[PDB]
């Protein structure tokens, strides 16, 4: 019986309805659930660009296509001359050279306002930053690999030209005793950072010409999409280059020994590049770089888009300060040595509470000699926390000396100080100064003059105890201010910004060589401000909840930290590692009894790797979403069991004497929406798994009964046996020193995430049904247009295609034209089948429609190369094409489409061997699309080309 192409089974319609339903739920809850606060302040400037037009085709062939600019900021740069450290900004996928605007303008203003007067800073080798930016014509870099290589080659030549600029007296005004620059600092955005890494492997790279790469939201670990084979190969090249170079034991054999790479990720608000791909932990050792999120950068504390990471005001200031702390024009490479650069980057980008954080004060030179009476009024008893409700009660400079406990106790102990008042730098009279004091011997022990050491007379008694004291300002941790009028760690309005808190955290072994911690209260009149300092035991402050993921997802975890709690408490859940699961954190009300608390509770949700910390000021209700173990990225490196999973750091007022409750439960819809960044690229490949299994069932029934069933009927027959079985095979495949372990299927071998295979399968069933109905609608619509033209008329009245591809037409244009000719054949087939309604006309229509669906699901992979080619034609760039690859990638489709235009139906199918070859080919295509589809989506075109050649063979046999 004639079965309509539009008819669908109830079983296949319900399954497709769930697939579309689960797609909407994932998409909807990825834009509404667990969304981070937006806290970027817009930045304004006066932009200007000087085109370096002497950098032309004599220097590089690509200079007819690309351009180089020097940023000049109005009010600062009054001429196009280079007077400082050269910095190169690389824009990303379809980015603009005019995106350096914010960061280049802040660098121009900061040197004008502050540094150019700081005479010590210039004497230390600090000059202005010359920001060069490159115009790539908004190239689609993430979708074409030859574009990436061209950009890297152009930029190596551009660095040669930039460094040549500093030799010309007519263009460079610099001190005559300075060395000539031999390096450029590279700041790359998105694909821009990837080009920077590629720049170091290209043949025309000049050695030692890049030593500092800072990338903003760059996918270092993995290509964003794998539609081009050259992108995948270049990622393999650069990732292998970093891994091999840093795996060398002798630094002379390490080409990247002097290179530091810092990767900054926008976070959860970045929906263009997954922040999971920014992790360089599998590429760069901690001595040479790190991955940091903008939510952990002090005085930024916000997540950002892919675009806002450049113009955000807070982050702009932070990055310019970090860049100005590394430059050194006294060295030919215009930066400090590698270790000093790493220390500065850690200071400016990291929270300071990491394990890699370095403490300066404990072993630093003493900066102040303090005189205190022997009456021990200042010296307090051990085990008492120092609480200063107000500053300046007495009206004179005071010293509070806290004795450091002896290290005899086996338990680990920490000294923690929290204040909302800015701590004085050495040699500065402010409101408050904290310093580590060591007792000076009564006997005149031989020592230096202590000329930097200043005096502070506070005794006025015979004792006059002498103390040599080191200011702890170098090691101050800046914490967002958690007052009870604060909602976010940031403030979009600069006027409403609360001055942040100051935090000190020391292990007792670090400061055991000292005798006291001196909190010098310099205020005289009573001024607002609190200081809490105490020593705490690791047992009392740190809690670990060893609860499995199943129990955590079922019941959640609840803690009741006690009232005796130290000011700072940590709660670690080692089983919270996945980036795909989102939680909800609740902190109980601090019932401060009889008094208001000194500050509101502050929570730091953080991960050991990558450096991804999030702050919740006035914490009561926090959305806990983390960037942990992501699906397709290389596996995390070995770590201590004390740094695994998720930890919460809690600061509360300890004087309230009220216990606090911490609850953590799972957010099901937020967890569901976490899947969109991670699995959006599955849908260029994995729906071919469903289509190939449907075409397998259509050909099976045809070869056995002679009837080519509709795509919907084939889908209904496949959902009963074939598709469920092959999803079980995918699950079994997942369960069965390599950095490409997580590149196939779901990318997660973890058996917990096996439900993702049925989830993706059902969503792709729904998507295939919808695309089928779209193709049917398009066929009917074109047929209606043709019939309408016919009625308007009535009432009112070859073998050359091979030559085209070999010369100038890329096979993607030919493929699009083949798809259009196939649509025309489909329209004729449908019209004929409606006119005649023969069983032979239904077979041809169904067969042509299925082949059209197969072609249409490969078209997405080929379209990105078409736009690149059209763009290059617009710019007048011509790219030669290898005739062997173009011809062999398009002839099977050309021949199939021609055969269909002749109207010939596929011959029905030693004969059983030809019958089984079609089944085997379609099964292999389904399995290959499922397994290698995400990472090698460019090979699907070739595989489907092979299947089309097989169909042409079967057509030829009869």
């Amino acid at each position: 019986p004639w079965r309509s192409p539009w008819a669908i089974s109830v079983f296949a319609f319900v399954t497709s309805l769930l697939g579309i339903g689960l797609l909407l739920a994932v998409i909807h809850s990825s834009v509404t659930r667990q969304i981070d606060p937006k806290g970027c302040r817009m930045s304004y400037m006066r932009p200007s660009y000087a085109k370096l037009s002497d950098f032309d085709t004599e220097h590089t062939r690509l200079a007819s296509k690309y351009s180089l600019y020097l940023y000049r900021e109005q009010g600062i740069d009054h001429d196009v001359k280079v007077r400082g450290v050269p910095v190169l900004f690389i824009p990303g996928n379809a980015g603009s050279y005019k995106q350096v605007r914010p960061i280049a303008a802040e660098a121009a203003n900061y040197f004008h306002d502050v540094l150019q007067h700081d005479e010590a800073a210039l004497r230390a080798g600090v000059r202005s930053l010359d920001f060069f930016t490159v115009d790539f014509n908004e190239d689609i870099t993430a979708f074409h690999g030859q574009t990436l290589l061209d950009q890297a080659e152009y930029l190596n030549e551009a660095i040669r030209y930039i460094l040549s600029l500093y030799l010309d007296p007519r263009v460079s005004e610099r001190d005559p005793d300075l060395p000539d620059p031999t390096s450029v600092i590279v700041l790359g955005h998105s694909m821009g950072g990837i080009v920077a890494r590629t720049m170091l492997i290209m043949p025309n790279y000049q050695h030692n010409s890049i030593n500092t790469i800072i990338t903003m939201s760059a996918p270092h670990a993995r290509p964003p999409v794998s539609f081009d084979g050259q992108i995948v190969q270049t990622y393999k090249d650069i990732n292998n280059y970093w891994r091999h170079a840093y795996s060398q034991k002798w630094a002379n054999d390490n080409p990247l020994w002097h290179v530091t790479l810092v990767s900054i990720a926008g976070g959860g608000l970045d929906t263009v590049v997954p922040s999971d791909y920014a992790s360089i932990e599998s590429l760069v050792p901690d001595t040479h770089g790190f991955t940091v999120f903008t939510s952990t950068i002090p005085n930024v504390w916000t997540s950002m888009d892919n675009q806002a990471i450049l113009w955000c005001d807070q982050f702009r200031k932070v990055i310019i300060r970090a860049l100005f702390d590394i430059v050194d024009v006294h060295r030919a490479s215009q930066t400090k040595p590698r270790a000093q650069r790493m220390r500065v980057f850690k200071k400016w980008f990291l929270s300071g509470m990491e394990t890699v954080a370095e403490k300066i004060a404990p072993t630093s030179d003493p900066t102040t000699l303090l005189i205190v009476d022997d009456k021990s009024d200042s010296i307090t008893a051990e085990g008492e926390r120092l609480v200063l409700r107000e500053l300046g009660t007495q009206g004179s400079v005071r010293a509070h000396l806290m004795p450091i406990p002896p290290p005899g106790s086996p338990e680990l102990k920490r000294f923690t100080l929290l204040t909302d008042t800015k701590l004085d730098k050495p040699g500065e009279n402010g409101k408050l100064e904290v310093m580590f004091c060591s007792v000076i011997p009564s006997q005149p022990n031989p020592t230096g003059p202590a000329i930097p050491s200043q005096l502070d007379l506070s005794k006025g008694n015979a004792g006059t105890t002498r103390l040599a004291c080191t200011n702890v300002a170098p090691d101050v941790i800046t914490l967002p201010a958690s007052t009870r009028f604060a909602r976010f760690p940031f403030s979009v309005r600069k006027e409403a910004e609360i001055p942040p808190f100051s935090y000190l955290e020391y292990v007792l072994d670090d400061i055991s060589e000292h005798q006291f911690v001196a909190v010098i209260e310099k205020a005289t009149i009573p001024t607002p401000g609190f200081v809490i300092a105490e020593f705490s035991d690791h047992s009392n402050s740190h809690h670990t909840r060893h609860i499995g993921l199943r129990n955590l997802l079922t019941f959640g975890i609840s803690l009741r930290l006690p009232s005796n709690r130290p000011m700072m408490s940590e709660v670690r859940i080692p089983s919270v590692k996945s980036s795909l699961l989102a939680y909800n954190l609740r902190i109980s009300a601090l019932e401060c009894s009889g008094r208001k608390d000194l500050f509101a509770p502050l929570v730091r949700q953080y991960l050991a790797e990558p450096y991804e910390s999030k702050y919740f000021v006035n914490a009561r209700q926090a959305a806990v979403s983390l960037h942990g173990v992501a699906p397709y990225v290389p596996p995390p490196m070995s770590r201590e069991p004390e740094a695994e999973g998720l930890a919460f750091q809690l600061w509360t007022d300890p004087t309230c004497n009220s216990s606090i409750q911490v609850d953590l439960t799972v957010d099901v819809m937020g967890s569901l929406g976490k899947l969109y960044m991670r699995y959006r690229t599955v849908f260029a490949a994995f729906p071919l798994f469903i289509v190939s299994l449907v075409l397998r069932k259509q050909f099976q029934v045809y070869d056995s009964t002679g009837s080519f069933i509709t795509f919907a009927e084939g889908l209904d027959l496949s959902l009963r046996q074939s598709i469920p079985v092959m999803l079980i095979v995918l699950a079994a495949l997942t369960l069965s020193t390599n950095f490409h372990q997580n590149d196939l299927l779901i990318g997660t071998q973890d058996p917990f995430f096996l439900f993702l295979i049925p989830l993706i399968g059902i969503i792709c069933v729904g998507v295939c049904t919808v695309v089928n109905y779209i193709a049917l609608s398009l066929t009917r619509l074109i047929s209606v247009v043709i019939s309408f033209i016919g009625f308007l008329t009535v009432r009112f009245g070859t073998a050359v295609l091979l030559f085209l591809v070999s010369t100038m037409i890329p096979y993607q244009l030919a493929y699009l034209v083949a798809c259009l000719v196939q649509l025309g054949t489909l329209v004729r087939a449908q019209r004929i089948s409606s006119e005649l309604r023969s069983p032979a006309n239904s077979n041809f229509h169904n067969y042509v429609h299925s082949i059209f669906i197969l072609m249409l699901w490969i078209l997405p992979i080929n379209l990105p190369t078409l736009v690149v080619w059209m763009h290059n034609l617009s710019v007048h760039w011509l790219t030669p094409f290898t005739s062997h690859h173009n011809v062999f990638s398009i002839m099977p489709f050309i021949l199939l489409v021609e055969t269909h235009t002749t109207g010939q139906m596929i011959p029905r199918t030693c004969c059983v061997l030809l019958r089984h070859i079609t089944s085997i080919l379609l099964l292999s295509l389904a399995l290959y699309a499922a397994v290698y589809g995400v990472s090698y989506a460019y090979t699907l075109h070739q595989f489907v080309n092979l299947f089309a050649f097989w169909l042409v063979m079967v057509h030829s046999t009869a």
Partner: peptide
């Protein structure tokens, strides 16, 4: 500024 003059531009954002």
């Amino acid at each position: 500024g003059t531009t954002s």
